[PDB]
Amino acid sequence: KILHRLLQD
Amino acid sequence: KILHRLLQD
Amino acid sequence: LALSLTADQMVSALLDAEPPILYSEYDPTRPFSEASMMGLLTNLADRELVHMINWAKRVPGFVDLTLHDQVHLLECAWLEILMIGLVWRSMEHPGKLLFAPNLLLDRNQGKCVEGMVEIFDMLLATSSRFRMMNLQGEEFVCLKSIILLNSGVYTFLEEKDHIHRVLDKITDTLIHLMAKAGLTLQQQHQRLAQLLLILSHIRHMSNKGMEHLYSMKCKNVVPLSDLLLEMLDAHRLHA
Amino acid sequence: SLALSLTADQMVSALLDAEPPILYSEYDFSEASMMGLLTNLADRELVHMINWAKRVPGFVDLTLHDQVHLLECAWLEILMIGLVWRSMEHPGKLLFAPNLLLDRNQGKCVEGMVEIFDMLLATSSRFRMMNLQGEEFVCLKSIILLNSGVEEKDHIHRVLDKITDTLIHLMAKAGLTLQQQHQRLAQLLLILSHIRHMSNKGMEHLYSMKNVVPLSDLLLEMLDAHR
Ligand SMILES: O=S(=O)(Oc1ccccc1F)[C@@H]1C[C@@H]2O[C@H]1C(c1ccc(O)cc1)=C2c1ccc(O)cc1
Ligand SMILES: O=S(=O)(Oc1ccccc1F)[C@@H]1C[C@@H]2O[C@H]1C(c1ccc(O)cc1)=C2c1ccc(O)cc1
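A: This is the predicted complex of the input protein with OBC.
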């Protein structure tokens, strides 16, 4: 999911 | 309005 | 004349105004269905509403409002008020919701009705939260009165300021209870915050509950009383 | 860890520096155009919100699962309290963007939106009458993020108590008496109940109108979380 990888930075 | 009535009784 | 009350007098008035614990019309001769389960909850809520109305009249400052304002506050907060009552009497029953002394249900029994187990889990989590915080009965009646006065106040002036004065009084009362309980000053504003943040979750559960109560009505699962219909038709709407 | 060790002023300054920018809309009309601007705006704000959340003390200490959950639950609340905050100095008006200032009549363009607009405006007017300060606002927004979805559970609660301490610190610093401090604190937090209410109702329309306008993939996944 998009939200997941946006947080993972 | 039933609530209206009940608030009076 | 509510603003002339002391803290102890606020508590005593609120404790004495408490509604009774009603029984459900639960019939154990037949198994649960979605309809039969929804019928029990509907019938129970309907009878509790009548007691809620008379309780609301005994809440300091409420009778000072116009009938239109009293109707609005109750229309906005009735399910919240039912729910906080439910989580309160379910505290000493881990993993269960005590709708009535003869109606004690767990989440698996909530699966009988479509989309209800989600609300049941939230209600259970809130009840557990209260149990963990060791919520006192004096604190509970304050919270329930805050819900009545606050939930519909932003959707209203002269007596709008009156409500906020009464709400400030209840705030004073809560702190007083916590101070008398021996909590440090820091602990007092932390606990005040904790209890009030829980009200946001209660609003949340009510909104989600109301949303499904539309659909149950719109799928003709159980007959709703005319009062309950009108309470539901205040929310109601709108999508 | 480090979040629990921050001072009251350090908490304030950390949240102030973490504040997201005020974005413009594409605005230069109909119901599709109205919804189009709002959704495009919200989608760009969501990107900044995610990076803002990572700068809220104690948030990165949480698992990615919990971080996702909290943002899924609170994203519209956060957008809304941001909206009412910048709309404070504009009575009867909603400042979605510096170039997009809307009154309640322009909210009648979309079916069911005027009801939400009125609730937002009333919230904004309530902030105006309380003379809500910027330092208080950033505390309220962080509380919303951490509360609306809540050893992890206890950590979130420990950070929440810290923000409570921060709010009280701000009020004491403002010269408010002890009784005035509790009262104002209660007032602020009860507004979060109304903000939750507005988000629940707004969400209820959004996964209805979701098919009117092109909703971005991120927005759709945030919408789906409430279903
Ligand atoms: O589970 S739900 O949120 O509704 C739903 C119903 C069906 C599917 C999904 C739902 F979310 C609602 C909250 C609590 O259980 C239900 C109920 C109630 C209330 C009114 C009513 O007409 C019917 C039910 C309650 C109650 C809570 C406290 C009480 O003292 C009494 C009842
Ligand atoms: O008015 S509503 O509740 O939506 C509707 C309710 C009823 C009918 C039609 C609606 F559109 C919603 C809250 C606020 O205005 C809309 C919006 C938004 C958000 C996301 C989205 O996909 C669409 C709209 C907001 C926003 C608030 C703050 C912002 O910074 C940006 C936007």
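Residues D 35, 38-39, 41-42, 45, 79-80, 82-83, 96, 110, 112-113, 116, 202, 205-206, 209, 219 surround OBC (ligand 2) (CB under 6 Å). Chains A and B do not touch (no CB pair under 8 Å).
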